[PDB]
Scaffold this active site. Structure first.
Site, PDB file in Angstrom:
ATOM      1  N   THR A  11     -39.350 -16.404 -39.042  1.00 38.15           N
ATOM      2  CA  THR A  11     -38.295 -17.213 -38.450  1.00 38.15           C
ATOM      3  C   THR A  11     -38.641 -17.636 -37.021  1.00 38.15           C
ATOM      4  OG1 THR A  11     -35.879 -17.375 -38.098  1.00 38.15           O
ATOM      5  CG2 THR A  11     -36.953 -15.306 -37.491  1.00 38.15           C
ATOM      6  N   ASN A  12     -38.253 -18.851 -36.655  1.00 44.05           N
ATOM      7  CA  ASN A  12     -38.511 -19.398 -35.328  1.00 44.05           C
ATOM      8  C   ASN A  12     -39.988 -19.538 -34.958  1.00 44.05           C
ATOM      9  OD1 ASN A  12     -35.667 -17.882 -35.128  1.00 44.05           O
ATOM     10  ND2 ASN A  12     -35.644 -19.561 -33.646  1.00 44.05           N
ATOM     11  N   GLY A  14     -41.715 -22.034 -35.717  1.00 43.04           N
ATOM     12  CA  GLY A  14     -41.868 -23.460 -35.481  1.00 43.04           C
ATOM     13  C   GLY A  14     -42.037 -24.324 -36.718  1.00 43.04           C
ATOM     14  N   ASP A  35     -34.027 -23.511 -46.423  1.00 41.55           N
ATOM     15  CA  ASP A  35     -32.741 -23.024 -45.899  1.00 41.55           C
ATOM     16  C   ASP A  35     -31.498 -23.690 -46.473  1.00 41.55           C
ATOM     17  OD1 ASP A  35     -33.882 -21.287 -43.395  1.00 41.55           O
ATOM     18  OD2 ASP A  35     -34.957 -23.248 -43.497  1.00 41.55           O
ATOM     19  N   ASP A  36     -31.676 -24.859 -47.094  1.00 45.36           N
ATOM     20  CA  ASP A  36     -30.561 -25.586 -47.705  1.00 45.36           C
ATOM     21  C   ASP A  36     -30.213 -24.940 -49.033  1.00 45.36           C
ATOM     22  OD1 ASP A  36     -30.567 -27.706 -45.728  1.00 45.36           O
ATOM     23  OD2 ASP A  36     -32.298 -28.545 -46.821  1.00 45.36           O
ATOM     24  N   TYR A  54     -30.344 -11.349 -46.253  1.00 38.72           N
ATOM     25  CA  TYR A  54     -30.705 -12.768 -46.209  1.00 38.72           C
ATOM     26  C   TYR A  54     -32.193 -13.071 -46.237  1.00 38.72           C
ATOM     27  CZ  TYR A  54     -26.077 -14.870 -45.236  1.00 38.72           C
ATOM     28  OH  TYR A  54     -24.805 -15.361 -45.287  1.00 38.72           O
ATOM     29  N   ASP A  55     -32.991 -12.105 -45.826  1.00 41.34           N
ATOM     30  CA  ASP A  55     -34.421 -12.324 -45.757  1.00 41.34           C
ATOM     31  C   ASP A  55     -35.186 -11.840 -46.973  1.00 41.34           C
ATOM     32  OD1 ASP A  55     -33.263 -12.656 -43.060  1.00 41.34           O
ATOM     33  OD2 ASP A  55     -35.325 -12.853 -42.360  1.00 41.34           O
ATOM     34  N   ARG A 116     -35.261 -16.047 -31.537  1.00 40.60           N
ATOM     35  CA  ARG A 116     -34.183 -15.730 -32.454  1.00 40.60           C
ATOM     36  C   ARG A 116     -32.853 -15.546 -31.749  1.00 40.60           C
ATOM     37  NH1 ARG A 116     -33.543 -14.955 -38.342  1.00 40.60           N
ATOM     38  NH2 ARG A 116     -31.497 -13.959 -38.506  1.00 40.60           N
ATOM     39  N   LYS A 159     -49.166 -21.748 -29.645  1.00 40.42           N
ATOM     40  CA  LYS A 159     -49.854 -22.964 -29.226  1.00 40.42           C
ATOM     41  C   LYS A 159     -48.863 -24.062 -28.903  1.00 40.42           C
ATOM     42  CE  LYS A 159     -54.392 -23.260 -31.242  1.00 40.42           C
ATOM     43  NZ  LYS A 159     -55.292 -24.064 -32.105  1.00 40.42           N
TER      44      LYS A 159
HETATM   45  N1  LIG Z   1     -44.687 -24.540 -30.518  1.00 38.54           N
HETATM   46  C1  LIG Z   1     -43.558 -24.145 -29.933  1.00 38.54           C
HETATM   47  N2  LIG Z   1     -43.569 -23.611 -28.702  1.00 38.54           N
HETATM   48  C2  LIG Z   1     -42.464 -23.147 -28.144  1.00 38.54           C
HETATM   49  N3  LIG Z   1     -41.299 -23.187 -28.768  1.00 38.54           N
HETATM   50  C3  LIG Z   1     -41.209 -23.717 -29.998  1.00 38.54           C
HETATM   51  C4  LIG Z   1     -42.349 -24.217 -30.613  1.00 38.54           C
HETATM   52  N4  LIG Z   1     -41.984 -24.706 -31.794  1.00 38.54           N
HETATM   53  C5  LIG Z   1     -40.673 -24.521 -31.923  1.00 38.54           C
HETATM   54  N5  LIG Z   1     -40.197 -23.913 -30.839  1.00 38.54           N
HETATM   55  C6  LIG Z   1     -38.797 -23.477 -30.632  1.00 38.54           C
HETATM   56  O1  LIG Z   1     -38.522 -22.251 -31.337  1.00 38.54           O
HETATM   57  C7  LIG Z   1     -37.169 -22.318 -31.821  1.00 38.54           C
HETATM   58  C8  LIG Z   1     -37.195 -22.455 -33.348  1.00 38.54           C
HETATM   59  O2  LIG Z   1     -38.108 -23.456 -33.809  1.00 38.54           O
HETATM   60  P1  LIG Z   1     -38.059 -23.977 -35.334  1.00 38.54           P
HETATM   61  O3  LIG Z   1     -38.825 -25.241 -35.412  1.00 38.54           O
HETATM   62  O4  LIG Z   1     -36.660 -23.972 -35.814  1.00 38.54           O
HETATM   63  O5  LIG Z   1     -38.894 -22.857 -36.141  1.00 38.54           O
HETATM   64  P2  LIG Z   1     -38.501 -22.367 -37.627  1.00 38.54           P
HETATM   65  O6  LIG Z   1     -38.142 -23.480 -38.534  1.00 38.54           O
HETATM   66  O7  LIG Z   1     -39.765 -21.520 -38.147  1.00 38.54           O
HETATM   67  O8  LIG Z   1     -37.312 -21.296 -37.454  1.00 38.54           O
HETATM   68  C9  LIG Z   1     -36.578 -23.576 -31.180  1.00 38.54           C
HETATM   69  O9  LIG Z   1     -36.259 -23.329 -29.809  1.00 38.54           O
HETATM   70  C10 LIG Z   1     -37.806 -24.480 -31.220  1.00 38.54           C
HETATM   71  O10 LIG Z   1     -37.611 -25.564 -30.308  1.00 38.54           O
HETATM   72  N1  LIG Z   2     -26.082 -18.886 -43.460  1.00 39.21           N
HETATM   73  C1  LIG Z   2     -27.411 -18.918 -43.521  1.00 39.21           C
HETATM   74  O1  LIG Z   2     -28.046 -19.761 -44.153  1.00 39.21           O
HETATM   75  C2  LIG Z   2     -28.118 -17.821 -42.717  1.00 39.21           C
HETATM   76  C3  LIG Z   2     -27.423 -16.891 -42.060  1.00 39.21           C
HETATM   77  S1  LIG Z   2     -28.562 -15.929 -41.231  1.00 39.21           S
HETATM   78  C4  LIG Z   2     -29.908 -16.825 -41.806  1.00 39.21           C
HETATM   79  C5  LIG Z   2     -31.372 -16.633 -41.398  1.00 39.21           C
HETATM   80  O2  LIG Z   2     -32.265 -17.630 -41.920  1.00 39.21           O
HETATM   81  C6  LIG Z   2     -33.540 -17.123 -41.493  1.00 39.21           C
HETATM   82  C7  LIG Z   2     -34.684 -17.851 -42.202  1.00 39.21           C
HETATM   83  O3  LIG Z   2     -34.771 -19.198 -41.728  1.00 39.21           O
HETATM   84  C8  LIG Z   2     -33.492 -15.659 -41.939  1.00 39.21           C
HETATM   85  O4  LIG Z   2     -34.191 -14.823 -41.012  1.00 39.21           O
HETATM   86  C9  LIG Z   2     -31.996 -15.337 -41.922  1.00 39.21           C
HETATM   87  O5  LIG Z   2     -31.688 -14.216 -41.086  1.00 39.21           O
HETATM   88  N2  LIG Z   2     -29.450 -17.794 -42.598  1.00 39.21           N
END
Ligand SMILES: Nc1ncnc2c1ncn2[C@@H]1O[C@H](COP(=O)(O)OP(=O)(O)O)[C@@H](O)[C@H]1O
Ligand SMILES: NC(=O)c1csc([C@@H]2O[C@H](CO)[C@@H](O)[C@H]2O)n1
Length: 179
Positions: A11-12, A14, A35-36, A54-55, A116, A159
């Site tokens: 998660t997060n 990017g 996620d949809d 959820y994971d 996160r 990166k």
């Molecule tokens: N390369 C990056 N460097 C720093 N922050 C990033 C980068 N890519 C994404 N982020 C930030 O990390 C958070 C989640 O990014 P996201 O694209 O939603 O990743 P994911 O879909 O895996 O959860 C947001 O703040 C996003 O702007």
């Molecule tokens: N309502 C949702 O879809 C949801 C609640 S928490 C959650 C988070 O989605 C992440 C994967 O992108 C996973 O780590 C969940 O904690 N999803």
């Protein structure tokens, strides 16, 4: 006739961001976000310790998503590109024989936990949810990947955002080149 690209990772890391970028500069390019396909809150389970599950694959309607992919694929034969982004993809067997290119984004534990916390989820992360469910499940996923027979291109999520995009972008043309 169609190119299917997989983008997974913790998660997060990017994924959404990489998907959107490629999307803008890739022709005849679509995006499906895993996620949809989450089951409703009323369908999610909480473990012994009061953690909503959820994971795990069980918290997602994957047969719904495969159906969405089939729709795209068959309507595509009428070069189409599909980017499937999600945090849990390379451990879902039905997809293994569909990938044309697989990318895995890696981000450290500290960065991941930090990013996160800047996001308010629904339901919101309970106290110690990250360490108690999110991280443990990712690690469990990383392990279920030791079995992967195909090739996953690992990316450094720390990166640059454009550096990741560019790394993937080049390769994607050096892959379409052989088309
Ligand atoms: N390369 C990056 N460097 C720093 N922050 C990033 C980068 N890519 C994404 N982020 C930030 O990390 C958070 C989640 O990014 P996201 O694209 O939603 O990743 P994911 O879909 O895996 O959860 C947001 O703040 C996003 O702007
Ligand atoms: N309502 C949702 O879809 C949801 C609640 S928490 C959650 C988070 O989605 C992440 C994967 O992108 C996973 O780590 C969940 O904690 N999803």
């Amino acid at each position: 006739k169609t190119f299917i690209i997989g983008i997974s990772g913790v998660t997060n890391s990017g994924k959404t961001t990489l998907a959107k970028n490629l999307q803008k500069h890739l022709p005849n390019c679509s995006v499906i976000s895993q996620d949809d396909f989450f089951k409703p809150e009323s369908e999610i389970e909480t473990d012994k310790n009061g953690f909503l599950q959820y994971d795990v694959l069980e918290a997602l309607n994957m047969e719904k998503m495969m159906s969405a992919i089939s729709c795209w694929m068959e309507s595509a034969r009428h070069i189409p590109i599909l980017i499937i982004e999600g945090f849990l993809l390379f451990n879902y067997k039905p997809l293994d024989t569909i990938w044309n290119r697989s990318y895995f984004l890696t981000i450290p534990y500290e960065e991941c936990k930090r990013r996160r916390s800047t996001r308010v989820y629904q339901p919101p992360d309970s106290p110690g949810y990250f360490d108690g469910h999110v991280w443990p499940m990712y690690l469990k996923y990383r392990q279920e990947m030791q079995d992967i027979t195909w090739e996953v291109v690992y990316l450094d999520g720390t990166k640059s955002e454009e550096d990741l995009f560019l790394q993937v972008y080049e390769d994607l043309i050096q892959e379409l080149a052989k088309q």
